[PDB]
Amino acid sequence: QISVRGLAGVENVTELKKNFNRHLHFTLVKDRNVATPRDYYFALAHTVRDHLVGRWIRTQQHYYEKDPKRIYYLSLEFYMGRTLQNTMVNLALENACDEATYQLGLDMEELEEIEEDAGLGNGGLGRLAACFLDSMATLGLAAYGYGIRYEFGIFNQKICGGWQMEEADDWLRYGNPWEKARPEFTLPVHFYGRVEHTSQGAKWVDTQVVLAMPYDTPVPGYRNNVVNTMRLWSAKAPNDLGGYIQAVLDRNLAENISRVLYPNDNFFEGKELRLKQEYFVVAATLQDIIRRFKSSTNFDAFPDKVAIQLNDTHPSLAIPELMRVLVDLERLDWDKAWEVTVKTCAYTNHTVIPEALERWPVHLLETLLPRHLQIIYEINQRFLNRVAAAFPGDVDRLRRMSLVEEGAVKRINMAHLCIAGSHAVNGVARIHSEILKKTIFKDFYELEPHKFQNKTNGITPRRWLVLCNPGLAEIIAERIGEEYISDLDQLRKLLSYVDDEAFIRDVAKVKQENKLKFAAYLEREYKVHINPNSLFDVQVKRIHEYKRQLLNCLHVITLYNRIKKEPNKFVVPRTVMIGGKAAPGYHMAKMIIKLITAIGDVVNHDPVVGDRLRVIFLENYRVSLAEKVIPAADLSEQISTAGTEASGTGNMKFMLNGALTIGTMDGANVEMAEEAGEENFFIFGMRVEDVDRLDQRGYNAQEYYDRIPELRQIIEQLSSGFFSPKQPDLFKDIVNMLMHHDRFKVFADYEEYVKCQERVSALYKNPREWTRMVIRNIATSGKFSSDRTIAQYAREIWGVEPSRQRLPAP
Amino acid sequence: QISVRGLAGVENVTELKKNFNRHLHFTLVKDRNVATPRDYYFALAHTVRDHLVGRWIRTQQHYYEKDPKRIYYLSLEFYMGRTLQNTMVNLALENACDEATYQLGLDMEELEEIEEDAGLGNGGLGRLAACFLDSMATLGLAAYGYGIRYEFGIFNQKICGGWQMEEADDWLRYGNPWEKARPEFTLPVHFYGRVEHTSQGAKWVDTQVVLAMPYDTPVPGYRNNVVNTMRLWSAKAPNDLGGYIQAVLDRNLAENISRVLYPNDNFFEGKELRLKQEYFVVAATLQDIIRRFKSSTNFDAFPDKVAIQLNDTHPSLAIPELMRVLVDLERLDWDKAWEVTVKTCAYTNHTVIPEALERWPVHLLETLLPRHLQIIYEINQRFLNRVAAAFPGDVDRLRRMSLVEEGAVKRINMAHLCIAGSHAVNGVARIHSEILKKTIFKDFYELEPHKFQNKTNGITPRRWLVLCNPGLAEIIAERIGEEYISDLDQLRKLLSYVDDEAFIRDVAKVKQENKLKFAAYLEREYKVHINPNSLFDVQVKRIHEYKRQLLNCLHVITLYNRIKKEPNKFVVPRTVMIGGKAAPGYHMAKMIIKLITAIGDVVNHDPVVGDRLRVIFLENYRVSLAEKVIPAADLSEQISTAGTEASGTGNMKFMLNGALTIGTMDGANVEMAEEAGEENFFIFGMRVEDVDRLDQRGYNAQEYYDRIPELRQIIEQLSSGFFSPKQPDLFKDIVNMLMHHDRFKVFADYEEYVKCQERVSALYKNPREWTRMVIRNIATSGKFSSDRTIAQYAREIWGVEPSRQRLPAP
Ligand SMILES: *Cc1c(COP(=O)(O)O)cnc(C)c1O
Ligand SMILES: *Cc1c(COP(=O)(O)O)cnc(C)c1O
């Protein structure tokens, strides 16, 4: 059908149909008479999977022969989403499979909807790991993603009575055709025990053993025949067990380690199970790395053949674990082992929010990992000696930089451990990286300035453009070719089409088709009533106070009140869509979701409003839903308080898909506006400097409430029960927070936000100019490709050169 | 190589090799350079499995079209063993696969040893279910085996310091290529709750729900293209869940139902988890049966289209569950529902031992299955009204026949429930069935004589002859053809070769080769030292006091003492092998194992003994080990106290494989001696009548101890610490039991047993005559084919005719 989807050759299609029927018969053990849509999905998946194996085997054989430096990306989250379409795209099999299934009398799009999302992540941090894997494969790097195979990913969200309800994400129920269990490579992981000091070195004895079983999933590069690996560990109890029956049943105690993903987004919860998960992934991965290193004993070359990237501090135990192995097992002297460790590890920070920082209680590490605690203490001591030497007499700096935090209970600052044991520390957006050097990590930057870098986040244009928005990818390819898909900077060539009447019309047509498509999906599933002609105003991301879904709510209520005030006055029609999950134990986030649905209950049923304003809460927001709503959006809401969103990535997805952005100068928003030009962005609100000034003076919400009549009305409506008749004080906690303890200054940006939104509605009334501004955004989104991000990590941190060379065919 | 293994055609072999390499590549994702023997085993398994799917699909389609009466065999145990070789045998693919792998440079026998036994059973009862499935498929019956997919089967037995150690049987670790998960057919099972009585009927509400997920395994008939199904249920928690994390982790509470097989053989343990397993299998299976019935609403025809066979009382809840469904859900009147239930169910009893009888406490059923308890009470009441009417005034008979047992705690006699709700009740050997009518079920037989039948057990000649003893199957086929493999009575034709010098020599040659083969295996694995020229005296079966492994021990010690008394006197060399597992909580059985190894520690290292006597304990006895040792045996020990072994099946395996039998007139031994002629059997000991006389008088072990010098010496050796130097009183419990509370009268059969063993050694000294007697046994073993057993069940209980017709090809 469309060019960018590859060729559907006679031989190829015939071969596909043949193999589809083979799998349906032999693999699924079914015949055409009893097969269900799910059976058909699996037959297709196995058929596509087959095309991947040959390349997978020779890619790995290739690395074994050329022995390049390996990149190990350690993360406790890999937010993969679905794998079928992405695999077809990267193998240029999409049109062929579409035709093959068409001839078999099946609708491929219907089959793709059956696949379960691999939701092994919470949000930004986990999805970045996913985009990164795609870019590393596309850039020909010998990379391996290492994580945990949770049998339950991020919970599925159900909305009942306007409230969030959580249900287990049993994504493996029907099986996972993409993974390959590798029981032969199982490794032991140790916990508890005690440390024994013998003549020649310390020994960690009397430990509890849990086995780590690896499951490998292929990661295909874009049309370059490279297929890398994502290895996920699963917990298994050893076989060596009222006495008998119970002993067997207790095996699940050990296997609970990989049972479920902790649903906290940017929030630290010091639970023992979480700590076990963190060590489990680190211990198994490091043995795997070392094993592979010794195959093709000086460890001096270790840093030249190995690079370990820590995604946040979750896998920070890799630092002391690597030291433990080198010093305790390999018997290297401390100083030598430390040099190797520092040169091997690099750390990526994802937030400056205090409640998100990992600070593990000493008594927990003491019981669970006694040897690691001793190593951490030794690291801290030698580090502080270095600080004392560089800043003589500065005793306060000593306590500020210590990895050990005194107080009620002693804690280990994992962020400090990561900086001390890494040769590179990076922020994820220019403003974020600057904030790290100027504030929270100022002391460390002063001691070792060379370690601090910036690596602005990015997204993969394969999943976030070609896969989810084929219509847009096609009209773009029509003018500039297909080269941009793996070289996004080429989109700048689109700048010469900003006055092209044909292009303007096509860009607008693609958006309209996406909106109609999504509007239908909302009806087909969930039975809603949105109007395709309205402006699609969307804010999708995890529910968090710093994200400010509440500021958006205030605007919605403002719009509704203005309409009720002057009913027959014209207003640009809008469909406000808000979606995202709230962590199960985050009360305020759960109240915000209820507020949104409550507002919808009033606004969507008011006769005077009509179809001029609709408020919809997008249920169960996840990767596959993002692929649907983002291409249909007109306005992207990125309104976090300045200085709180380290980077953001959703913002980049919206920009690449033709939506204009309304946001604060926070995270990557600053760089996006810089690339597209501020006049092509809807910027508003306090800048980081403004927030600091307010904090110096002291934030008093009452002041805003007293001086802004429209705001006062909203707060009084919430308080009086206008949005909760049967429960008048239902939102008392929300009002109290906004009025007395709002860490994110919602009221402070209210006025500028509302005015900015007016400028948005004004531009939307002029279709031609709205579309021209859209073209200016899409054309300058190239910098946000994760291929650019990965190329920088490769050259500036890992010391390897990316390659676009096709691997010697399949 | 050998005839009975089929043809290895040019096209077939080429096709096999091609598909072997396909699976190694695409299925296992490996190449010739990194593949291990296990990888090769799986490639072969998947290749053979492929040949099974086509027949499997059309067999089931066939039943759907012809709609014959279905046979449902309900059992909590299916002792399957390995599946690879058995599948090749039944598909006539053995020689082809042997050649194909040979050309690929692989040894198929080495690959077969890699497969994990499917040990979902304890012993006799579970293996019978397995043989039965094979025979039902071979006889073309539309049969389905229904059970539980335990993730842990019978524990693997390790011997440490002479003691049994148990370790988890993680048989699914590397995956099971034979099963096919059918998540689409998942069914809900209810537990707990309470009963509500409404206007129109009772309702079971507020229940806890556990899902039953089925896994189907194919069961191929012998060269008839029939492939039946064994459906095993797996427990899964529903998705509808500190609050969050814990809720997810607690899912394993529900999934523990199918976690592990209870390791008790012929012993009842009233644990709640076991009760849940029993209802789980019954509830899921009955919904599946009814669903299938309604597809191709009078339930009057239900008995004409459905037959449910209960293997022991474990699945006895099927009776009240069927009533519950018909009365509560389908709304049939009681009397109508009961008529249907009785005509549908049939019960098979496996033992008369009191401690093995299931008597569930009322308070347990009351809490777990409140509605079923009410139904059982109603059944009991109407049954007793029938008894009161037939035997007016006989109040003691009323309490004796009641399904409800009064006493310390009220219990439900599940055996009584089975008789009341079944149209047929059968014993498993003539003597056993007679004992049921004369003793434990005498009252029931008097009330309904027509219900009681006999169905002597049998074994499948495919696994127990062709598969494990190809050498013997071949020399037999050389004279009488291959027809006997599915018509074992033809072995009688071998009677005309009893004087054939060529045959006598071949039979003896095959046995010698099997012994050398096994002797090697004992060395290769476990490093032992047996002598192939000695008489292989073996007793393999579960360790139990009624089996009398102790009587055997006494003989061994007697032999050892006689040698020490007259060292230079000639004695026929023997290798005594004893094997079997002991239930984890059965103390005496565990002490018996230690005694055996202890005896070996003394006997095997005494210089004076030399290689004239060896005592070896066969570790981890299981189906695959049985296939190895049985063909190598010269003497089969079947020495249970008369009246305690209902039938036995191991005895039949030894008879079919050329071993002579030394045993009591118990179980099927009586029928075996009857078929072969008593002069061709080594019968000894008390008969059932003799045991009763002794009980009338009162058994006093002391009498035997006082009158038999050799026996007194043995007991004094055990007591003094002769077999346990460091621990003199180690076997005090054994001696005390033998002397004061031996329920099985070991001493009473000692003298006759020893004398009989002398007659055995005498015959062994005459190779020619020993072999001629062996031929007389093999030739008359035909009656013990499970094909005969199944044909009788079909005609006399299920009302269906067996068929030997080939199904319309694959
Ligand atoms: C891209 C993405 C995110 C991150 O969005 P932000 O707005 O940067 O927080 C979160 N969830 C999903 C499903 C995503 O695809
Ligand atoms: C045949 C068999 C049994 C039953 O043997 P008996 O001597 O009748 O108790 C037990 N275990 C296994 C592994 C068997 O193959």
Curated annotation (Swiss-Prot), chains A, B:
One Gene Ontology CC term in the entry: skeletal muscle myofibril
Any one of the GO BP annotations: glycogen catabolic process
Pfam families registered for this protein in UniProt: Phosphorylase
Binding site for AMP: 31, 64, 291-296
Catalytic reaction annotation: [(1->4)-alpha-D-glucosyl](n) + phosphate = [(1->4)-alpha-D-glucosyl](n-1) + alpha-D-glucose 1-phosphate
Annotated InterPro entries: Glycg_phsphrylas, Glyco_trans_35, Pyridoxal_P_attach_site
Xref: CDD domains: GT35_Glycogen_Phosphorylase
Cell inner membrane as UniProt keyword: no
Keywords: Acetylation, Allosteric enzyme, Carbohydrate metabolism, Glycogen metabolism, Glycosyltransferase, Nucleotide-binding, Phosphoprotein, Pyridoxal phosphate, Transferase
Presence of keyword Transferase: yes
Modifications after synthesis and translation: Phosphorylation of Ser-3 converts phosphorylase B (unphosphorylated) to phosphorylase A.
GO molecular function: glycogen phosphorylase activity; nucleotide binding; pyridoxal phosphate binding
NCBIfam families hit by this protein: P_ylase
Described function: Allosteric enzyme that catalyzes the rate-limiting step in glycogen catabolism, the phosphorolytic cleavage of glycogen to produce glucose-1-phosphate, and plays a central role in maintaining cellular and organismal glucose homeostasis.
Protein name: Glycogen phosphorylase, muscle form
Species of provenance: Oryctolagus cuniculus
Lineage start: Eukaryota, Metazoa, Chordata, Craniata, Vertebrata
